[PDB]
Write a protein that binds this ligand. Structure first.
Ligand SMILES: *[C@@H]1O[C@H](CO)[C@@H](O[C@@H]2O[C@H](CO)[C@@H](O[C@@H]3O[C@H](CO)[C@@H](O)[C@H](O)[C@@H]3O)[C@H](O)[C@H]2NC(C)=O)[C@H](O)[C@H]1NC(C)=O
Ligand SMILES: *[C@@H]1O[C@H](CO)[C@@H](O)[C@H](O)[C@H]1NC(C)=O
Ligand SMILES: *[C@@H]1O[C@H](CO)[C@@H](O)[C@H](O)[C@H]1NC(C)=O
Ligand SMILES: *[C@@H]1O[C@H](CO)[C@@H](O)[C@H](O)[C@H]1NC(C)=O
Ligand SMILES: *[C@@H]1O[C@H](CO)[C@@H](O)[C@H](O)[C@H]1NC(C)=O
Ligand SMILES: *[C@@H]1O[C@H](CO)[C@@H](O)[C@H](O)[C@H]1NC(C)=O
Ligand SMILES: *[C@@H]1O[C@H](CO)[C@@H](O)[C@H](O)[C@H]1NC(C)=O
Ligand SMILES: *[C@@H]1O[C@H](CO)[C@@H](O)[C@H](O)[C@H]1NC(C)=O
Ligand SMILES: *[C@@H]1O[C@H](CO)[C@@H](O)[C@H](O)[C@H]1NC(C)=O
Ligand SMILES: *[C@@H]1O[C@H](CO)[C@@H](O)[C@H](O)[C@H]1NC(C)=O
Lengths: 122, 117, 433, 105, 431, 117, 124, 430
């Protein structure tokens, strides 16, 4: 089964960068699905902060963090990262990876990751 | 690893190893000629579809759910290539015809008179 | 919308297929299978792969049969024709060595053309009774038994047909799948399938009733048959232990060269000196008794609560009612009734010798075996028995055509065509600049 | 893209049929997931596309979406089902989420 | 001022070419023309193609001829060689069905060696006067005719030569074009050209003056020749309606067997059972005459007068003066002088039967036809005529060769080589 | 389908058409070998020129006003390939020589040690 | 002018590669077999060179650059000596015991290049 | 340092190789070598190259040899077999001359089955003594020679074996290198090499001891050998001047025909009218003596000892000790002892004729040559001598099994395989 896991979350100082990352060796190596990140603050639902067509490198970051959520992936390592810069002091959320599995239709966001949380603060 | 080493593997993992006496005289000539014809048939199809030199070749032909309606996550991480070949064997010629048409249209656009020179 | 056709080349799939295989390594087999043998074949196990095999529909067997017939006939083309010997033969009793009768042979005289085409000479030769047919009742006039139906070709004395191991190899684009299940019976699915380019070496042995010098079963004795409850099918019993058998003709046949004509000559038996007995053959008695009992133990799993018994062949000519084999170039026809007689230090099987051999089912062709001088003894192992079927269940040492001798070695191999090109959906559209 | 939390509050008594409404600002597929989880823990899909009931989930607890109208259906409320219902604008890049329905049970 | 060279591969063009076609499907034709075929019409109309055809220069006719001869020679290789029979024969008048004067037959006795060379036997068989030649005057001593010049091979009784349809198919890179003009005369431009992979299925039926079996013209009767004016050319007449012809040997025959040597045996006529009138070949008076008149009306397009006449064939050997039929295993040689006799109820043609024949116009390798046991009846469709032109204008039912028989069906097909590479100008320079 | 006009985009169908008793056996082997020779001959010629793995290729060789002296609209719309090839621009050996030379010069320029462009 | 450049320097001879290459394909029973064998082998030799070039990444090329460096052990010469003074026939012998090594290195390099390109596709 | 491995294709290099050459040009050679030649053959001079040629190991000699024999044997298949003639012969003294004194011929009568089976007739023909063997002592019972070991095939009457020149041509992927050194002399480097696709025209002449029609040396007399210093080796002396030789059979034959079977007849000498000498050759005396003097002047550079002698071919059978000429359809065996007798207006070589000819040195495959009607004269050009060697040196005419004659035309040619791939260092990385 898929086993995506989050890593390197941090209580980053406001405006600091942190190399949040995940890996999912059990899942297909880009041959399928796509990278997707989502996050949620306490008392919040979710937002599709970032994505990438992992088969290659076609990025699709959300406007909310257009200047920071530079999602990237290494198909070769069955791994991905979102080393956002200039964290807002308000950017405190759990973040998790998902598999954008699809069938000639919008993706299902399957195999949600462990969701390690960060805690950016001033 | 090995020739056909991935035959029992799922398609995903398997895709990572794609880099792997006149009586007698007539039989030998037939064998040699046939081997050449088979070689050329595969290279010619890859050429005509715009996949010459590629083990992995993307195309501009969309997947039609009628050929198969499965999710990538239940194909690449689940079934073997032998099974896949059987599942869509009935559409083999359809796919090939579409690939040829797409490549020929791409070439016509390449040399169209407008917005070329 | 978001799924695209992607072409993959080098995909590990294959199809059942029939192709022409090539044969890899003085004599015939050695000059025909001129292609060198791979000194270090690489057998690749296909993990989590199963495949369907069927030894009774295996075209590798059929192809081997055709190659053998072709080689045999091609090898005999540049040889002496014996058509000139179809002349009426004047035959007497034959009294070789001492003042007695050599049973099984006759002393025949005949009028043969000398090198000059006008004059003729009278020559003598000894022949076996099995090759000679009486022209009329109470007559002393005989003919060679096969001049009625075809030409008889003398085998070239310089050409050996002794089996050597040979390998069948697939051409590029093809591979041979091999079944490595120790108890597989030859049909249906086989797990643990491996891929090879060439088969193991096998020998083109042409015996009947008892298979000689083959491989042994990896597991216990395997009884292989198509639809075993069908009395119309042949049962191949593949032994896991061999039985040693030795056949001897303890005498010296002299050789007389009779010129036929312009560079043409016939080799006749001259005189026979030695122990005049019927080419006796010795098979271990205790080995046989135990071996046959073991076969029955397994045969009873298909035919439970029945008394399994054995009888000698019920009929046909002395090509099938006997154990025919060709060891030293001397063609033996041994009586196996001493073995297949049961109610479930050695057993002597008397044997006859024939000199004109109608091999396989060619019918319109015949070969004459030149006499072999010296005292000949042959040693071989029995590696499988051929039985036919029909509160007693009776089996007999019957058999089919010669394809069955090779089915027993090629039962584990299948030929497939490799099809490396294929497609599948993914989620990456061609970039197109 | 956008979608409203049409059922921001959605409590139901055990064994009662229920659905957590979603109102999209545009027609879209309406994949949804249950937040049957601890904070900073994985969510799980309810269904994909318009009606692709999730694997390893009750099929009974599902309904098809149409146009801009959708809901995360439940055959019956149960404590086991007491998870928020998150609705995604599953047509859009970086699809927008409606705030999840409380969907208490 | 800004045009550039562009190379195109896959260009739909061709050039005339001569290549090897393959022949597609106990019968010899069914063994040699081994490739299976499905219907696969594939009649692709090219719409605007007007191509030049020429049936008189068509290499397929010659290729068909060479392959047919090759098949016959190959088919006769594994058969009995009738050499021990080139002996003096002591012959008398054949007697059968209570008559000792059977015209055309001799009762011949001879000494032939048996399988055992030291022994010989005296054998008897009946032979035709067209197979046997007298050795001297005032003598019963005879010889077989072809023992004078060559070997005689007995056709194998187990081998069928029935002219089942065969198809000629192009190799990859080649295509066969068809002329679909209902009034095409055999040469020149043909509009409405279509492309196929194989021919329609041609029956290799052999004849000498009437063209038997095959298709009929879909138009009116067509007169075709390399040159109508030139008296040195063959004129083929392709009828649009068939003429039904029936031939028979209603009498029974028995066969005997002589063991000429080991394995081999010679088959020969035993006895004749029945009357002694042979062949009885006929067509209706209501079909002939009118058919011939229709041909004349078409001849009048080239010969616009009332002095047209049909005369009996001229001299030469039997193979060119009479009408050969391949009725079953026997060869009929029919007298057609009763048909070609006119100036501008059924008609019976007597025929003779021959057993030792020289095929086509070749010399040697004579073939011997074993007799048919029992009686034989053959029914066939006359589809055309082979006519020549030997003031008034006389036509004769003869001339030509053995290839003209196939020109009559292959005239509508042409073989071309595809040459899919060419150059044309563009507006784009290489980037 | 050689009718229509030169502005055809059916080219793939004329490409896939290529490459699919000892007397008989020799004739059939000759037919197969020859079909292969011709296929390879065309591919090599295209391969020497810069047109490799394409059905339509442009070059650096200008079109000569004396080969046809026609406009592009006349050529592509009022003529088909059979007429084009049979009547005009039917001295192709000139063009072939120009194409081979131009391509070798280009390829040589690309590895000049002074400018590894 | 086939082999016309055989005595020319290696550099000069690079302008006749098309001439030398365009003449590699062209330009009773036993006789027919000998001629079929000759034609079939000419085709096989042509194709084996094309397959090898494809293995090294030389698809449709007469001159190919690589990612494999030259080893001074194979030949310790400079460019002004090897391209300008020597002819091909004069140094081909020097590499006769290194040819298989070089070919193996070119194959390995191509495999690594393809893997990087395979793992990192270009989409959209 | 830069320097990356650059791959090149179309590189003008080659390696020694052996392949099958094709032959290019009723007549047998014309029928077989049906392939046309280039009306204007091209030749490329390879400047600044050196190539090692070795004629003694040149596989073209062997290949041409095998193909010539194969053609000959195939050419004799579709015609008359003479096995039925292997019967006891009467062979009385021939009476063809006016005084019945030829003594080289016998009048042989025999009982033969005619084309009609079960009918035999007494037939007769004249035969040469060289083709007839006596069956026993003091008995006028004779046989043809090749009846006990093999069988005789009659030469096909419509096929000419005239040695019209033929050319050998390389297949694609191969080329033939030719040596243009007029003084090459034998195995070793040639410093002037050109490339051709086809060899010059070579006439498949079958003489022995003396070479007949062929090319002449372009330099001085060239003496070629595998090793001139070893005995047991053939020495080929290639002259730069020809010597005219005129050979004839000054008498008139008439042919008789004995039917054998359907499609077959035996042809034999019926009668011969004329004088007694069967045949002879005319060699100008001064030309011959001058020619040997020139040969000796060159021979002396390898063999400095004076008083070099020539002897009349040692000994052996009448295939070795004499000359051999296929003159029209007759095979002459001329005595050359009149030439090779010396120590350092014309010379008559008496000649014998045979009709049963052994092919090369094969066992069996005997051919019978029908008599040629009327009188015959052949004129040919002697181009060289085939000598063997055994104080002073002794030279004798001799020769090998035909290959040595063919080595005299193919000595300047070599077959090489073209190898278009190679690599070289360059300054550009991928
Ligand atoms: C060396 O070369 C000369 C010159 O070509 C050869 O002489 C030629 O030999 C042939 C066969 O003997 C002669 O052909 C015959 O000519 C008569 C003429 O009436 C004709 O009736 C025959 O049917 C046949 O065609 C040819 O005329 C003769 N040429 C000359 C100029 O005399 C000579 O045979 C060659 N020597 C050797 C050993 O190859
Ligand atoms: C051989 O001798 C036995 C003695 O009983 C006799 O019966 C038999 O007929 C004899 N056979 C011949 C060929 O003389
Ligand atoms: C066969 O008969 C001949 C007659 O001469 C005699 O010499 C020979 O010894 C006999 N051989 C045998 C085995 O009887
Ligand atoms: C059977 O004997 C043959 C020949 O001696 C030999 O190849 C084979 O190993 C023998 N088998 C055994 C185990 O005796
Ligand atoms: C026409 O032929 C049939 C068959 O030979 C025969 O029965 C009939 O009598 C014939 N007609 C005439 C008029 O003789
Ligand atoms: C041979 O060398 C000379 C200079 O010595 C040069 O001019 C000539 O072009 C060279 N030949 C070839 C084939 O390059
Ligand atoms: C020819 O045959 C007779 C037969 O009587 C014989 O006497 C004579 O010696 C034979 N030969 C000669 C040369 O006369
Ligand atoms: C070769 O013989 C012919 C005979 O016609 C003669 O013309 C030619 O000059 C001779 N050649 C030599 C080198 O003597
Ligand atoms: C040469 O021929 C002439 C006739 O032309 C003859 O007189 C002379 O004796 C012959 N000489 C020689 C040496 O053969
Ligand atoms: C043959 O004899 C005639 C007699 O007139 C003579 O003219 C001719 O030259 C002679 N030919 C030969 C080859 O001696």
């Amino acid at each position: 089964x898929x086993x995506x896991x989050x890593x390197x979350x941090x209580x980053x100082x406001x405006x600091x960068x942190x190399x949040x990352x995940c890996x999912x060796x059990x899942x297909x190596x880009x041959x399928x699905x796509x990278x997707x990140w989502x996050x949620x603050x306490x008392x919040x639902x979710x937002x599709x902060x970032x994505x990438x067509x992992x088969x290659x490198x076609x990025x699709x970051x959300x406007x909310x963090x257009x200047x920071x959520x530079x999602x990237x992936x290494x198909x070769x390592x069955x791994x991905x990262x979102x080393x956002x810069x200039x964290x807002x002091x308000x950017x405190x959320x759990x973040x998790x990876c998902x598999x954008x599995x699809x069938x000639x239709x919008x993706x299902x966001x399957x195999x949600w990751x462990x969701x390690x949380x960060x805690x950016x603060x001033x | 690893l090995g020739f056909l080493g991935a035959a029992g593997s799922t398609m995903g993992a398997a895709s990572m190893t794609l880099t792997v006496d006149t009586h007698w005289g007539i039989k030998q000539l037939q064998a040699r000629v046939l081997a050449v014809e088979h070689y050329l048939r595969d290279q010619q199809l890859l050429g005509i579809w715009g996949c010459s030199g590629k083990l992995i070749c993307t195309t501009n032909v969309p997947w039609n759910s009628t050929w198969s309606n499965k999710t990538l996550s239940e194909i690449w991480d689940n079934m073997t290539w032998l099974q896949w070949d059987k599942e869509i064997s009935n559409y083999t010629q359809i796919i090939y015809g579409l690939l040829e048409e797409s490549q020929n249209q791409q070439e016509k656009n390449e040399t169209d008179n407008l917005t070329c020179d | 919308e978001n799924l695209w056709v992607t072409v993959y080349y080098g995909v590990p799939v294959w199809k059942d297929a029939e192709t022409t295989l090539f044969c890899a390594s003085h004599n015939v087999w050695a000059t025909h299978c001129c292609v060198p043998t791979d000194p270090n074949p690489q057998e690749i196990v296909l993990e989590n792969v199963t495949e369907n095999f069927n030894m009774w529909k295996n075209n590798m067997v059929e192809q081997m049969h055709e190659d053998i017939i072709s080689l045999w006939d091609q090898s005999l083309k540049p040889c002496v024709k014996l058509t000139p010997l179809c002349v009426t033969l004047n035959c007497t009793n034959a009294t070789a060595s001492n003042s007695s009768i050599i049973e099984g042979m006759k002393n025949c005289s005949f009028n043969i053309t000398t090198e000059l085409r006008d004059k003729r000479e009278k020559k003598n030769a000894l022949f076996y009774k099995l090759d000679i047919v009486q022209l009329d009742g109470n007559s002393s006039q005989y003919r060679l038994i096969n001049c009625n139906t075809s030409a008889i070709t003398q085998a070239c004395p310089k050409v050996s047909f002794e089996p050597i191991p040979i390998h069948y190899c697939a051409p590029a684009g093809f591979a041979i799948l091999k079944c490595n299940n120790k108890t597989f019976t030859g049909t249906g699915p086989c797990n643990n399938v491996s891929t090879v380019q060439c088969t193991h070496g096998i020998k083109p042995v042409v015996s009947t009733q008892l298979l000689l010098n083959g491989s042994l079963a990896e597991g216990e004795i395997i009884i292989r048959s198509e639809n075993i409850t069908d009395n119309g099918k042949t049962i191949l019993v593949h032994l896991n232990e061999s039985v040693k058998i030795e056949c001897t003709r303890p005498n010296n046949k002299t050789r007389t060269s009779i010129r036929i004509g312009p560079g043409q000559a016939f080799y006749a038996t001259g005189q026979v000196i030695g122990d005049i007995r019927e080419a006796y053959c010795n098979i271990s008695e205790s080995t046989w008794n135990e071996t046959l009992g073991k076969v029955v133990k397994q045969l009873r799993k298909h035919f439970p609560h029945k008394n399994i018994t054995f009888q000698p062949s019920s009929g046909g000519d002395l090509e099938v009612t006997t154990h025919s084999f060709n060891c030293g170039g001397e063609f033996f026809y041994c009586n196996t009734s001493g073995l297949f007689n049961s109610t479930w230090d050695s057993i002597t099987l008397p044997c006859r010798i024939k000199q004109i051999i109608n091999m396989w089912q060619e019918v319109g062709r015949a070969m004459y075996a030149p006499p072999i001088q010296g005292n000949i003894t042959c040693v071989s192992n029995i590696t499988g028995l051929i039985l036919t079927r029909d509160n007693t269940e009776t089996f007999r040492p019957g058999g089919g055509d010669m394809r069955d001798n090779w089915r027993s070695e090629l039962y584990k191999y299948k030929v497939v065509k490799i099809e490396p090109l294929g497609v599948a959906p993914t989620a990456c559209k061609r970039r197109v600049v």
